[PDB]
Amino acid sequence: LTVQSERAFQKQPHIFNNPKVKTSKRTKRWYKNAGLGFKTPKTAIEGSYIDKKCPFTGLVSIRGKILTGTVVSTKMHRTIVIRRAYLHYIPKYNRYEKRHKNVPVHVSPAFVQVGDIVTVGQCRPISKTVRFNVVKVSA
C-alpha cells in the first residue's frame, strides 16, 4: 500500500497528468507490451505501484536469455532468489552430477512465494547481482 512511502515523490517520468484538463477518469498510467508472448498482468495496468525496474510499467527492456527456476527466497524487497538445478556430464564416468546455481531476480509488484516456478528475462544490470526480471508466474 501507500506508494508514496519514500522521501522522494514516486512517478513514471515524462508522464504528465495535467490538473488543467479536469477529468475524473484516472491518472495517466503508462505501460508496455514486454514482448516474446509475455502477457502484461492486469495488476500492472490497473494497480497504482511505481517501479522503475518493472518490465511492464518501467524503463527496463527484456532481451537475451529467458530462464526458469524455483523460488527459494522472498525476503528482499522487490527481488527474489531462484534456484536453477541442472545435471553436469562427467565424460570419464559416462554419468552426471546434480549441480545448481542461484540467480537473484527483480520481481515487479505486478506478481510470488517460495515454491513457485517462474520464467525470468534478461535485462540491463539492475543491481550488483540482478540481471533478470520476473516475466511470468506458474504455480
Partner: protein
C-alpha cells in the same frame, strides 16, 4: 590492448584468401572501409595472389598509384582497400571488369563481366529508418546510405544501384520463390530458391533453401542475399552456379578432364 591493432599475422588471416604459410609472417590487414574485415578481399590479394599481375606488394602500389584500378567506379590508392561481395573492380588497361562473387568452396572467384553489367551492383538493405528532417534512408550491405527510397522497400530486400549516380534503379522484395546467394557459413557460395522463413522472436530467423538439384539446406537470415526471381539472376553468376557437388561427383568431373 590500449588501442586498435594495425597488424594481422598470416595464420590469423581469413582462410578464404588462400595465402601461403611460408612466404611471409604478416598478411595484408584490410583498412577500415565498406565491408567487414573477415568478409573482405584486399586489393593486394586480388591483384597479386588471384590475378597474378603484381608479384610483390611494391608492384601492387605501382599499379594503384597509376590510377588504373577503380572499385565501384572510383579510383583507390590503398593496397589494403576492403573490396567485398558484389563489388565491381574495373581496370582501365586490359578493359577487364570483374565482380567479386563467391564460388561454391566459399572463396572469391575471378569472375569477368561485360562493361554493361559493371554499371550496377546489388545491395542487401540492412536497416531502413528516418533520418534528420524526416528524410527516410536505407543502408546497404556495403554501408551506402541512400536517401528517399521506395516505401515498399523493407529490411532484407536487395536493391540495384547505379554506381555513377548511386541511386535505386530497381529492387527485389524478400519472399518465397526468390533466388538467393548465401554469403556466410558452411553453405557460403551456394545458390538456391527460398522455400520458407522460420520466425523465432528475439532470436535468429532461418531460411530453408532448395537448389536446382533438389538439395534443401537451412541458413540464418543474416547469411542470405536475394539476387533475383526463380531462374532470373540479376547479375551474371560464375561457373558452377552455386550447386555444391559431392567430393565423389567432383572427382568424376575431373576424370572427364583427365582424358586429355
Amino acid at each position: 590492448a590500449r588501442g586498435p591493432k594495425k597488424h594481422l599475422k598470416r595464420l590469423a588471416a581469413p582462410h578464404h584468401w588462400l595465402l601461403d604459410k611460408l612466404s611471409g609472417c604478416y598478411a595484408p590487414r584490410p583498412s577500415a572501409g565498406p565491408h567487414k574485415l573477415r568478409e573482405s578481399l584486399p586489393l593486394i590479394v586480388f591483384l597479386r595472389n588471384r590475378l597474378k599481375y603484381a608479384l610483390n606488394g611494391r608492384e601492387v602500389k605501382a599499379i594503384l598509384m597509376q590510377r588504373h584500378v577503380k572499385v565501384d567506379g572510383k579510383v583507390r590508392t590503398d593496397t589494403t582497400y576492403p573490396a567485398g561481395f558484389m563489388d565491381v573492380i574495373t581496370l582501365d588497361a586490359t578493359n577487364e571488369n570483374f565482380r567479386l562473387v563467391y564460388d561454391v568452396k566459399g572463396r572469391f572467384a575471378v569472375h569477368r563481366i561485360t562493361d554493361e553489367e559493371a554499371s550496377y551492383k546489388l545491395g542487401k538493405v540492412k536497416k531502413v529508418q528516418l533520418g534528420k528532417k524526416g528524410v527516410p534512408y536505407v543502408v546497404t550491405h556495403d554501408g551506402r546510405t541512400i536517401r528517399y527510397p521506395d516505401p515498399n522497400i523493407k529490411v532484407n530486400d536487395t536493391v540495384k544501384i547505379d554506381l555513377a549516380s548511386g541511386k535505386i534503379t530497381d529492387f527485389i522484395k524478400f519472399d518465397a520463390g526468390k533466388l538467393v546467394y548465401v554469403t556466410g557459413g558452411r553453405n557460403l557460395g551456394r545458390i538456391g530458391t527460398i522455400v520458407h522463413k522460420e520466425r523465432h522472436d528475439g532470436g535468429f530467423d532461418l531460411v530453408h533453401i532448395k537448389d536446382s538439384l533438389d538439395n534443401t539446406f537451412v541458413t540464418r537470415l543474416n547469411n542470405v542475399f536475394v539476387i533475383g526471381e526463380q531462374g532470373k539472376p540479376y547479375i551474371s553468376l560464375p561457373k558452377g552456379k552455386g550447386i555444391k557437388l559431392s567430393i565423389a561427383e567432383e572427382r568424376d568431373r575431373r576424370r572427364a578432364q583427365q582424358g586429355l
